[PDB]
Amino acid sequence: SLADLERAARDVLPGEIFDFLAGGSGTEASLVANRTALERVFVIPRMLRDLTDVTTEIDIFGRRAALPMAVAPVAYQRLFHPEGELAVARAARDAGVPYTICTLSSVSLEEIAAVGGRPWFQLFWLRDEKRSLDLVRRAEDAGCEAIVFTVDVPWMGRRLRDMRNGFALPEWVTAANFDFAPATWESVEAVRAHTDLPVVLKGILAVEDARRAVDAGAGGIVVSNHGGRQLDGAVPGIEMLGEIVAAVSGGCEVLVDGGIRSGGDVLKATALGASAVLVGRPVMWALAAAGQDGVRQLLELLAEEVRDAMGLAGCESVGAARRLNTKLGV
């Protein structure tokens, strides 16, 4: 799987960049808990069903995706490889997986979107509502299909790895969308009224926040502790997903991320009730280790592992994988 890639990335990247990537907030309690949560989940597979036409495809936000997965927004991809966002966006397009353009992309969102595929745009709320809504309109004018409003960063968590490294953006990595402020529910309304694209709230962990996101007109949420990078001691998304799925009752798409490292982890997420996962760090290890061709290989291996895991679980379709039962281990 992806475990060699992690090493290959540790080798090629300067320590302080691999730390920017790998790290969480505080004591990294939430970073590690993301993995322990997935490792505790056991799937109950079903046997003897028709697998003649096993398909990993889903429809999400009006469109077909090849797998129940999107590339998570990860800022400043030129930190990992000279072609940064463009290499990832190309591989994503060719794998039929959505790609989430960041607000802090090291290439302009217009350029990334011209790559084609299914680009989404991740929004950080700026101090000026008009700058925020102009970023939303640019993304929509540029053909982005969803606004992934990041709602768990009223400010960045305390990253002790980057504080200890005195890490700072190299001169040659820029925020290309530019020549910030806590978001609120009113900020969500402002975006929702400005766009006809689906608004996807990223970083929901409370059941009542899931519910309110539906009330608020979200088309989706991402059940996420931000890869353990925001509140240290935040519950993992994976530990809140089943509850959140039951409370939303079909009222928006429910994605999850944090620690997805395999196809089997995708199967577990789907059996908990997720519509799709986001994968972050692994796509940046592939990017670091081998640029566009590395990301394309990661996405093919993940595509094979999802298909393998589904069929061994008796699931012809992602919808069947959602109906699987689970059992929690120790």
Next chain:
Amino acid sequence: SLADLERAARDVLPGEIFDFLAGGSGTEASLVANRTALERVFVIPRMLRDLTDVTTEIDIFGRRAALPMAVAPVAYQRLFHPEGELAVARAARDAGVPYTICTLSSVSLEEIAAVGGRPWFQLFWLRDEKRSLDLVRRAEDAGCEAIVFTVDVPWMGRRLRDMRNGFALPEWVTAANFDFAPATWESVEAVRAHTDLPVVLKGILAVEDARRAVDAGAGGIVVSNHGGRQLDGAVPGIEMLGEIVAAVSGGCEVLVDGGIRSGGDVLKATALGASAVLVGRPVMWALAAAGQDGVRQLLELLAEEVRDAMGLAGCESVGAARRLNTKLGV
């Protein structure tokens, strides 16, 4: 117990063969979980009962067995020792334990069955229904007493040990029954209508699959994650057994396997409600380390450990061992 044998086998076998044997799918989460599940189970022994006539015998599929245990189907036994299946089948016969002939046996099922004893036949479903049913008829014509239909291998799991070893069958190990396709419930019907032998579905983990197996006319099931070799993250059988036993309500025999390493583990399986266990890897460690006499010694040591464990638990009979209570530890 068997722990020396494991070492003795590691010594004598080429690394890549010991890996074929020892390995599971994916990250081996289900391989390890099989052991953690049994280690969590504590038996509540009963005291002061009559042990004058302690007997480990059971009746299963019309016939007496000496212990609540059969040899699991393990392909290509000539990988482990020159006499392969014949050495194991001889030791099994002389120990009064059923032996499961594989579809991928490295000696023909007719030869293995001529050894006598209580041979069962494990069926992999082939692409051609007529080849499948002809393998069933051969087994029945050859005096096999049960068809162990393996229902958890629509295709083989991803074995990272064998992928990393680029492992492949030596020239001198053949599939002797030959000069494959996902099974379904219709495949089960096809076998059930073709034979009067008991059909035993191997690889059931879902309660509703157990129930349906009874509905379908199975004479037995094996509650099994295939030794952690199929879906990585599949629940252990041992973790589903009690639920499955309660749902079947006596309607077929319920075997379990995965990680049985002692007589006490046999006692635990029986106290959870299993009719019998299958033992896989340990019979191949004995075979590797000492051929027929090694398997016979393993089966005598297991026979002594089962009898010891039963009497220390106050059980004169396997039926009394099924009535024991358990308590789950950490």
Next chain:
Amino acid sequence: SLADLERAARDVLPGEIFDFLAGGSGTEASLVANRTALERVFVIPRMLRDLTDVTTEIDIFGRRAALPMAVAPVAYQRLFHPEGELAVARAARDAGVPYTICTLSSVSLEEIAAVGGRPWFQLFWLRDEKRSLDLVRRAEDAGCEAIVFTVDVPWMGRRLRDMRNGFALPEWVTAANFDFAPATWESVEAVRAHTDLPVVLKGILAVEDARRAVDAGAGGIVVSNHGGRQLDGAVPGIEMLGEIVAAVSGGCEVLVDGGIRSGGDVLKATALGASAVLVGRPVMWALAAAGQDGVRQLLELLAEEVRDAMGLAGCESVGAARRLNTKLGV
């Protein structure tokens, strides 16, 4: 506490004797679980009560004891020190703690009892009922106050340490009461009708066995997996004690043993509802390391630790310690 003593004993004893002492059955799952069970138990202390007259004394089987504790029966004490049972019995008497004379004592039970104090006698059932009942009468004629009928040894568990050591009784260690058979409930009746002493069944783990022991006229039970020396995978006593206490409802004394290593462990046992503990291995480490004076020092340190733990928990009396609540940790 006792942890230095363990080392001091490892130093002075031949490896194979320290193994006779330290060891359990099978994989020692039940030996280790005894410790993990006590370590999981947290006491909820009470504050601000009157401690003016804190007393560790109890009345058990008609008589006062200085602490809620007795010395467990441990065979062949001359293995650990030349004065063997006599050194332990002297220290026990002078500490006001009952001492359990073994059926396999390396000094005659008449000699051990002449030491005075509060000797109990542990009975193994022999093949001949008349030899058994004659051992009971000797103990009673010798002034023993209780018969501790060991009911968890229809035969000795498989001790892999002693099998691997080919351990056997030295020539100079004898069974002094001599110049065996599974006990049953009828054996219990036979003893109960032969003596007016309290009969204490040692090795009860099932709730229904506790209840039946009361029905049968037992004056006590010892909730015990025999220090993990009998069924490997037997639940720890400490894990069944609260349930057993509730089911007996005051109908006999309920002792527990296995892994008691401190006064705080005595407090935990009492807060679970035990009347008293037995301590085995620690009394033999003291004996090995320093003979009679070593056992007397162990008993004084345990006496101080029990008194300390009780007062820090707000308990003036052992009866108050039984009313404490507990909380189970991980």
Next chain:
Amino acid sequence: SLADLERAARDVLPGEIFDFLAGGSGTEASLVANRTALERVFVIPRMLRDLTDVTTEIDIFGRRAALPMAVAPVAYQRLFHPEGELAVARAARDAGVPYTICTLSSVSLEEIAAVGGRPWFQLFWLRDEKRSLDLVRRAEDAGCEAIVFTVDVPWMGRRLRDMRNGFALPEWVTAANFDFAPATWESVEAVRAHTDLPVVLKGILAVEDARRAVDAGAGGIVVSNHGGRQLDGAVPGIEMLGEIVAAVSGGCEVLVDGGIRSGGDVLKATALGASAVLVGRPVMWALAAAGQDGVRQLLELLAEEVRDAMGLAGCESVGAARRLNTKLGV
């Protein structure tokens, strides 16, 4: 965070003093459990609330504090640094955090209180009720705002580190308030009738003790196992807090301590329902490593971490942090 400081303190202090500070009673089961309890607690953060005016302030015992935190009473602060209590009290005052003057302060309580700020006084009950009540009156005459009656030390726990070190007060460290006896509920009444200051019972772990403390006229309790220094095997405070909070139903302030090492730990304590925490050992590591300026820096870092954690959890106020939900991990 504080983890470097711990090392810096280990370096500068004599082993036997760092052990006086770091150590618990018995096997330190309760010392370690304090940390495992906090590490098991996950917060469920809320998103998208107004953080325009995030404030860490609370009102407690009539007065504003800058953070939900006080310095715990820790005896003989001149052990850690020449300025001992005065350095800590100065830093506490300037950080707007209450400081708890000990009965065994190595500077007189009148001197410590002249520093100003929000001094509380911790009371150990003496053999003579009149000495006890005269210490209470001195504290009140000296402008202390609360009496923190320590109710979990009828006598000091067995500190094996200090027994093994034969540790004893250096000649140059004195008990400055001087030129002891178990407290009871009558002792609590005696203090309550002698002072109009709030009486805060420190070392409550039982629900019924919490309730009785309210009945008794306490203004507060501290849910505390005394940093694992008193009963070894005492439940952690953090494990009883939620239950205690629910039982008090607003009837007194409920503080907690034991193992608070960060702002996130403060957030966890508050989400469990605590009014405020006490921090002990970390304030003495800062003191040892850098005297007054070290304590002031610790309090600024803790102040920043609390504010960070609150905002990442969507809490504008400590009252909002109390309403957060939690989820217990493994």
